[PDB]
Design a protein around this ligand. Sequence first.
Ligand SMILES: C=C(C)[C@@H](NC(=O)[C@H](CS)NC(=O)CCC[C@H](N)C(=O)O)C(=O)O
Ligand SMILES: [Fe+2]
Length: 329
Amino acid sequence: SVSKANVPKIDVSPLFGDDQAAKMRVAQQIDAASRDTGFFYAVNHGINVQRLSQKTKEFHMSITPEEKWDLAIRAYNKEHQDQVRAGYYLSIPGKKAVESFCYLNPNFTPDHPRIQAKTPTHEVNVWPDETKHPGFQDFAEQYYWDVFGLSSALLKGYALALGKEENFFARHFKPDDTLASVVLIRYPYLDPYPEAAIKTAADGTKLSFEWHEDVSLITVLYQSNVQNLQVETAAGYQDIEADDTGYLINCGSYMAHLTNNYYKAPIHRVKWVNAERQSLPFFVNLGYDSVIDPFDPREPNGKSDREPLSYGDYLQNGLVSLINKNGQT
Ligand SMILES: C=C(C)[C@@H](NC(=O)[C@H](CS)NC(=O)CCC[C@H](N)C(=O)O)C(=O)O
Ligand SMILES: [Fe+2]
């Protein structure tokens, strides 16, 4: 069997308060986890994840095929040319088992300057009919802000961990402009489970999603309590334990770029499991024009030979590349 990955549980509650020394002790834990497997569980995070799961299940189990077409992104519905990121990602029974619903910043409204400009990666969210899904949009928008708040706290810990002031990332992570996304992914139980919907790794492991690094600064994930993720390490792919009270945190490739791989974006993959479950990531993205000068916390003078990259350039290029590599979700 594969060995268990070292995924420590870190109590992040000090990151919400004003005890600077305690924040440093959290930052050290983040540093250690980021230098090791690249994953940790954030605990004492303050979010009601059980309610998140319940509301998400009520949505996934009640939405109809009709509504899925009507919410579909462009990849599934040519009539919806503005929906590149936000909307419904359909399953293809017999071929693609997973389905999902993505939404973006609720502040991306029709009058937002980036929406008026039609700037890439910005879109106005689409939502199902309120009468068919009472309370869902309100719940989902509030969840965006709850996980935004946790993410801001986590970003203060990553900044302190890297030797920076606590707002070093967080000053570029703003309610009015963040490109962050929530994805409500449904993995189904299927009997029989179609082989075409199961991928196979070079080591023989059955997978739902192949190896990748995340397109994010950090990723802040709630999943059901069903083991499925693996992380590549020196010792091969290792299993990340489940814990559906904590949030699983890892860095994405923008952090790797900014830190000159001090905090790598861990390569990870999703095992095939025949289970009805949920995967609810929040991809922590900055603003379109956010640029942080790359640095190197292993170099005496802190300098890096990487060029600055705006977050919008990073994101637009990354999302396309991930689809080309691992397929349209
Ligand atoms: C555990 C996870 C976080 C999930 N992974 C994915 O489905 C992949 C790789 S993390 N995610 C994406 O395809 C990126 C989605 C970006 C989003 N659709 C957007 O527009 O922001 C999974 O469960 O499969
Ligand atoms: Fe990922």
